Short mmCIF file of all heavy atoms in Angstrom, two decimals:
data_model
loop_
_atom_site.label_atom_id
_atom_site.label_comp_id
_atom_site.label_asym_id
_atom_site.label_seq_id
_atom_site.Cartn_x
_atom_site.Cartn_y
_atom_site.Cartn_z
N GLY U 135 150.73 167.10 -1.96
CA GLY U 135 150.74 168.57 -2.09
C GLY U 135 149.56 169.17 -2.83
O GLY U 135 149.61 170.35 -3.21
N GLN U 136 148.49 168.41 -3.02
CA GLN U 136 147.31 168.92 -3.76
C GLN U 136 146.31 169.67 -2.86
O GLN U 136 145.13 169.32 -2.76
CB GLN U 136 146.62 167.81 -4.58
CG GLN U 136 147.51 167.27 -5.74
CD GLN U 136 146.84 166.12 -6.51
OE1 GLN U 136 145.61 166.00 -6.52
NE2 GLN U 136 147.64 165.28 -7.14
N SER U 137 146.82 170.72 -2.21
CA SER U 137 146.05 171.53 -1.27
C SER U 137 146.83 172.83 -1.07
O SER U 137 147.95 172.95 -1.58
CB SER U 137 145.89 170.78 0.07
OG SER U 137 147.09 170.83 0.84
N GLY U 138 146.25 173.78 -0.34
CA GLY U 138 146.90 175.07 -0.06
C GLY U 138 146.18 176.25 -0.71
O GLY U 138 146.41 177.41 -0.35
N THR U 139 145.35 175.96 -1.72
CA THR U 139 144.36 176.91 -2.23
C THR U 139 143.01 176.19 -2.28
O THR U 139 142.99 174.95 -2.40
CB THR U 139 144.67 177.46 -3.65
OG1 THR U 139 144.55 176.39 -4.60
CG2 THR U 139 146.08 178.14 -3.73
N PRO U 140 141.89 176.95 -2.20
CA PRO U 140 140.56 176.38 -2.41
C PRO U 140 140.46 175.62 -3.74
O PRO U 140 139.82 174.56 -3.80
CB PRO U 140 139.66 177.62 -2.44
CG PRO U 140 140.36 178.58 -1.52
CD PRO U 140 141.82 178.38 -1.85
N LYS U 141 141.10 176.14 -4.79
CA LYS U 141 141.06 175.48 -6.11
C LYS U 141 141.78 174.13 -6.15
O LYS U 141 141.26 173.17 -6.72
CB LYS U 141 141.62 176.41 -7.22
CG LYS U 141 141.48 175.82 -8.67
CD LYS U 141 140.03 175.52 -9.07
CE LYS U 141 139.91 175.16 -10.60
NZ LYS U 141 138.67 174.32 -10.87
N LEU U 142 142.98 174.05 -5.57
CA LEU U 142 143.69 172.76 -5.48
C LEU U 142 142.88 171.69 -4.73
O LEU U 142 142.77 170.53 -5.20
CB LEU U 142 145.08 172.92 -4.83
CG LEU U 142 146.19 173.57 -5.68
CD1 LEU U 142 147.37 174.06 -4.79
CD2 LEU U 142 146.68 172.59 -6.73
N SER U 143 142.34 172.05 -3.57
CA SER U 143 141.57 171.09 -2.79
C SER U 143 140.25 170.76 -3.50
O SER U 143 139.84 169.59 -3.56
CB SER U 143 141.35 171.59 -1.35
OG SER U 143 142.58 171.56 -0.61
N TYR U 144 139.59 171.79 -4.06
CA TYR U 144 138.36 171.58 -4.84
C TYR U 144 138.52 170.53 -5.96
O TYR U 144 137.72 169.62 -6.07
CB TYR U 144 137.86 172.90 -5.43
CG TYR U 144 136.63 172.74 -6.29
CD1 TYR U 144 135.34 172.86 -5.75
CD2 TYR U 144 136.74 172.48 -7.67
CE1 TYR U 144 134.20 172.71 -6.55
CE2 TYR U 144 135.61 172.34 -8.48
CZ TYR U 144 134.35 172.46 -7.92
OH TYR U 144 133.25 172.32 -8.72
N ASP U 145 139.55 170.69 -6.80
CA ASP U 145 139.73 169.80 -7.94
C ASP U 145 139.92 168.33 -7.51
O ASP U 145 139.34 167.43 -8.12
CB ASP U 145 140.88 170.27 -8.84
CG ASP U 145 140.50 171.50 -9.67
OD1 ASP U 145 139.29 171.76 -9.88
OD2 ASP U 145 141.43 172.20 -10.12
N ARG U 146 140.68 168.13 -6.44
CA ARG U 146 140.94 166.78 -5.90
C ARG U 146 139.65 166.13 -5.36
O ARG U 146 139.41 164.93 -5.61
CB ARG U 146 142.04 166.85 -4.83
CG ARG U 146 142.47 165.49 -4.21
CD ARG U 146 143.84 165.60 -3.48
NE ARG U 146 143.87 166.79 -2.64
CZ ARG U 146 143.45 166.84 -1.38
NH1 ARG U 146 143.03 165.74 -0.75
NH2 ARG U 146 143.49 167.99 -0.73
N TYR U 147 138.85 166.90 -4.63
CA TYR U 147 137.57 166.38 -4.08
C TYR U 147 136.47 166.27 -5.13
O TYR U 147 135.62 165.39 -5.04
CB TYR U 147 137.12 167.17 -2.82
CG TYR U 147 137.96 166.75 -1.64
CD1 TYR U 147 138.97 167.56 -1.14
CD2 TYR U 147 137.79 165.48 -1.08
CE1 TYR U 147 139.79 167.13 -0.07
CE2 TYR U 147 138.60 165.04 -0.02
CZ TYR U 147 139.59 165.87 0.47
OH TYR U 147 140.39 165.41 1.50
N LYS U 148 136.52 167.13 -6.14
CA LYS U 148 135.60 167.08 -7.28
C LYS U 148 135.80 165.81 -8.14
O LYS U 148 134.82 165.25 -8.64
CB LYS U 148 135.82 168.33 -8.15
CG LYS U 148 135.10 168.36 -9.50
CD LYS U 148 133.84 169.16 -9.39
CE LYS U 148 133.38 169.67 -10.73
NZ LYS U 148 132.12 170.43 -10.57
N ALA U 149 137.06 165.36 -8.29
CA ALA U 149 137.36 164.10 -9.00
C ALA U 149 136.59 162.92 -8.40
O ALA U 149 136.04 162.11 -9.15
CB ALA U 149 138.88 163.81 -9.00
N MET U 150 136.52 162.83 -7.07
CA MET U 150 135.76 161.75 -6.42
C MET U 150 134.26 162.02 -6.45
O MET U 150 133.45 161.10 -6.65
CB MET U 150 136.24 161.48 -4.99
CG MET U 150 135.48 160.37 -4.24
SD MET U 150 135.46 158.77 -5.13
CE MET U 150 137.07 158.13 -4.66
N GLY U 151 133.86 163.28 -6.24
CA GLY U 151 132.43 163.61 -6.33
C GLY U 151 131.84 163.18 -7.68
O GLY U 151 130.77 162.58 -7.74
N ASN U 152 132.56 163.51 -8.76
CA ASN U 152 132.15 163.15 -10.12
C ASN U 152 132.14 161.62 -10.30
O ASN U 152 131.19 161.08 -10.86
CB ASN U 152 133.10 163.77 -11.16
CG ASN U 152 132.89 165.28 -11.35
OD1 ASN U 152 133.72 165.94 -11.97
ND2 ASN U 152 131.78 165.82 -10.84
N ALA U 153 133.19 160.96 -9.81
CA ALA U 153 133.30 159.49 -9.83
C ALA U 153 132.10 158.79 -9.18
O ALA U 153 131.51 157.88 -9.78
CB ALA U 153 134.62 159.02 -9.18
N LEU U 154 131.75 159.22 -7.96
CA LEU U 154 130.55 158.71 -7.28
C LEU U 154 129.27 158.94 -8.11
O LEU U 154 128.49 158.01 -8.34
CB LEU U 154 130.40 159.32 -5.88
CG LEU U 154 131.52 159.04 -4.86
CD1 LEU U 154 131.32 159.91 -3.62
CD2 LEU U 154 131.59 157.56 -4.48
N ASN U 155 129.08 160.17 -8.55
CA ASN U 155 127.91 160.51 -9.34
C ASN U 155 127.71 159.60 -10.57
O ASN U 155 126.60 159.14 -10.85
CB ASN U 155 127.99 161.98 -9.77
CG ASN U 155 126.69 162.46 -10.38
OD1 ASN U 155 126.53 162.43 -11.60
ND2 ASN U 155 125.73 162.85 -9.52
N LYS U 156 128.80 159.33 -11.30
CA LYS U 156 128.69 158.61 -12.56
C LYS U 156 128.33 157.13 -12.42
O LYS U 156 127.89 156.52 -13.39
CB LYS U 156 129.92 158.81 -13.44
CG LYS U 156 131.19 158.12 -12.98
CD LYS U 156 132.36 158.45 -13.97
CE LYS U 156 132.78 159.92 -13.91
NZ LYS U 156 133.94 160.21 -14.81
N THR U 157 128.48 156.57 -11.21
CA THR U 157 128.07 155.18 -10.97
C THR U 157 126.55 155.05 -11.07
O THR U 157 126.04 153.94 -11.20
CB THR U 157 128.47 154.70 -9.56
OG1 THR U 157 127.67 155.39 -8.58
CG2 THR U 157 129.95 154.96 -9.29
#
Side-chain angles (χ1 to χ4, degrees):
Chain U
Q136 294 177 25
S137 77
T139 67
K141 185 60 170 156
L142 286 163
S143 289
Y144 177 91
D145 286 339
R146 183 162 46 88
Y147 284 104
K148 171 98 158 179
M150 179 56 81
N152 286 168
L154 298 171
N155 191 265
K156 72 181 68 177
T157 70

